[PDB]
Design a protein around this ligand. Sequence first.
Ligand SMILES: Cc1cc(-n2c(=O)c3cc(Cl)c(C(=O)C4=C(O)CCCC4=O)cc3n(C)c2=O)n(C)n1
Ligand SMILES: Cc1cc(-n2c(=O)c3cc(Cl)c(C(=O)C4=C(O)CCCC4=O)cc3n(C)c2=O)n(C)n1
Ligand SMILES: [Co+2]
Ligand SMILES: [Co+2]
Lengths: 380, 380
Amino acid sequence: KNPKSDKFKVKRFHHIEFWCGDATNVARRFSWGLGMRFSAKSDLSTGNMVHASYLLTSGDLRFLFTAPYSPSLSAGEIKPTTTASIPSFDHGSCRSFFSSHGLGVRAVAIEVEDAESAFSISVANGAIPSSPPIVLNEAVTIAEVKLYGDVVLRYVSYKAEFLPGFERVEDASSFPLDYGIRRLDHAVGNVPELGPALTYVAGFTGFHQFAEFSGLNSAVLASNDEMVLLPINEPVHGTKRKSQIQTYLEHNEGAGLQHLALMSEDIFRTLREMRKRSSIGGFDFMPSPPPTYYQNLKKRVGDVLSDDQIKECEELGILVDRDDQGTLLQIFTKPLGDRPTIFIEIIQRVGCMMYQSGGCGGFGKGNFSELFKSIEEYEK
Amino acid sequence: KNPKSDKFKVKRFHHIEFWCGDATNVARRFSWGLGMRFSAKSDLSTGNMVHASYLLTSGDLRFLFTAPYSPSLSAGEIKPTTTASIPSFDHGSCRSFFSSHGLGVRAVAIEVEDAESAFSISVANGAIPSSPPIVLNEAVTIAEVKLYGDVVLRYVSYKAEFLPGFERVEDASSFPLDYGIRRLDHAVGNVPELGPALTYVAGFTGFHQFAEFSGLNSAVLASNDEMVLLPINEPVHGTKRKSQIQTYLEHNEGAGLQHLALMSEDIFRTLREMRKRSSIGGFDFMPSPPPTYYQNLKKRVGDVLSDDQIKECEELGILVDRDDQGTLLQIFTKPLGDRPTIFIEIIQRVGCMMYQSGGCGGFGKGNFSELFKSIEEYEK
Ligand SMILES: Cc1cc(-n2c(=O)c3cc(Cl)c(C(=O)C4=C(O)CCCC4=O)cc3n(C)c2=O)n(C)n1
Ligand SMILES: Cc1cc(-n2c(=O)c3cc(Cl)c(C(=O)C4=C(O)CCCC4=O)cc3n(C)c2=O)n(C)n1
Ligand SMILES: [Co+2]
Ligand SMILES: [Co+2]
């Protein structure tokens, strides 16, 4: 069921912002590992004395990487005279975030019709304000409320290219890498307690629970057209294997964003390209599932993928799950940084065509039991 | 003249340690951009609950990248019970260093006969102690004294592979990249005042002044065989163009390491390989000198390089300088991180064969006047 209860008009995911200590090195690593192009910048070369911010793009996906400069560069400025292109930025907040959590997502940004109204209605419905609405160059309005931990939900609205104060990057420095990644599919948070977190977020957004079909319980909030998907996990304590959610919470120093799922238009091409670069600066992937796994997929998705393609999943280590209206191809990276916290999922969805409706195939929770049983069968 | 006044036996540069906020992303970027292999690690997977440290190697060059974990992971430990593989490490020092300077070199490490004796003699001769000698696994001794700013000189001695507590990296994760870089040639510091800095360092090491042949005055300290070379710069104020040393000091929040010079066995191959990767995750280089420059090199080094090779310097943007016993090929990267502070030099030296003696060709200070005059001639 979809009651369409959004308390304000939401459009799509807009960008994800990482808070870093050195934006350059993280952005260059991500660009090479994921096949994203350098498209915009705001830094010393553009007059920004406060923070260095670099934008990577692939299809509709926008990754922003931001780090603070020395506060001494901007000590004469006041908020009305700031050279920061993102007015919510604060040196102390950013250094406290990175020293506390290490590399991670600070903002999940969604585009809305009216960011000032979204902020007002959100806070009137229980949202804890983070940064009030500010209008940038009479063109864009941005506002921020708390989502979970030190992660914020950022509203962006345009009257009528990223943000004012950002410059398009030189053609020479902008190499057109592309491994087929096209858009953000969902962004997932880990919290100690699921109930209060859902009640809080669903309370100020009006997002509804998206129904689906080990180590965690979770629930998915979705916007009216179910294109903005915000799952949340909590641990389950007292099992044989320690919950990966609890491990996250300890190493992250509390709640925060667990994974980003990026939609590919050709998950085979994406994973061939990413795996080619794993040991030369890119991303490592989860251990591949036992042979027994792929020996059972024919009996479960043999109607959607040919024998050639299931052996292509074989090589790349892709997992496949199936709901009632669609099928889901998915694979997970190892953690993106030093700590066992944030990672990335690559996905492709098959079915549910009207365009494709959101969440087609679910989030792969059937692969929990399938992988467990398959580990046992390979042992035998 | 070389008085050979070293107060203790010094061998060679051993490693350079960068203090980072995320060691993984910096190390992966550097490995791809410079062609260095992942050879050793100390982190959660090796039992280190304190810091993540990754070692890159190319020839004899060793780059170490270290970042702190959450202090909560090791809150029960005391120094006698520590799981840190580098006992000098301190969470607060590391976070204070990175928030103050951003990405930069924390330690310049040289191998000595006896690190405990080097420390004692150094401090008896004015060195400010940083970390007393500690013997690791009855096998290696390390000790640290202050060099300039928050950079330390690290003594390492072996009784008889990097350090105890580090593990060799898996063959699958260790891809054998190599662009021809072979060893560290010199490591250069920027200070506000040259006199007191030289007096301090020469005072506790016995290093002597290595003689050579705009915006700075500098001086080079050298060990007995002149294989450990430690230049130091200060600004010259009151010129037309603002001194790059003063710019460094402002953006770095004071003194620190300015550049690392890496010797290549084939600087043409190194720069073809590095420039191929500049826009796909590697390093950018200085703007190439005007055409008039290469139109004058035949008249100055035409005896050492052929017309084919001088036009090969043409393409790659290599500079060439010449002293009285040797010739120097050199080129500079853009800054390695967000701030206009640390950069890298690639060099190759020609001449002075007995093996090659150190400093053969100097440090390129003749290229200052040559580039100025060449900019004028291209304007004409
Ligand atoms: C190996 C191996 C591998 C897995 N494993 C996982 O850990 C695993 C962890 C996560 Cl966070 C997700 C996931 O994407 C998801 C959402 O986006 C929303 C609701 C919560 C949720 O689960 C899927 C996983 N899948 C499919 C999987 O197969 N297991 C259990 N063992
Ligand atoms: C363009 C352009 C380009 C340069 N330029 C520089 O900035 C420049 C800056 C430095 Cl720090 C060095 C250098 O390596 C060096 C030492 O290692 C020890 C003593 C101090 C010293 O100078 C060489 C440079 N060279 C050759 C050069 O050509 N100028 C002046 N203009
Ligand atoms: Co997911
Ligand atoms: Co130099």
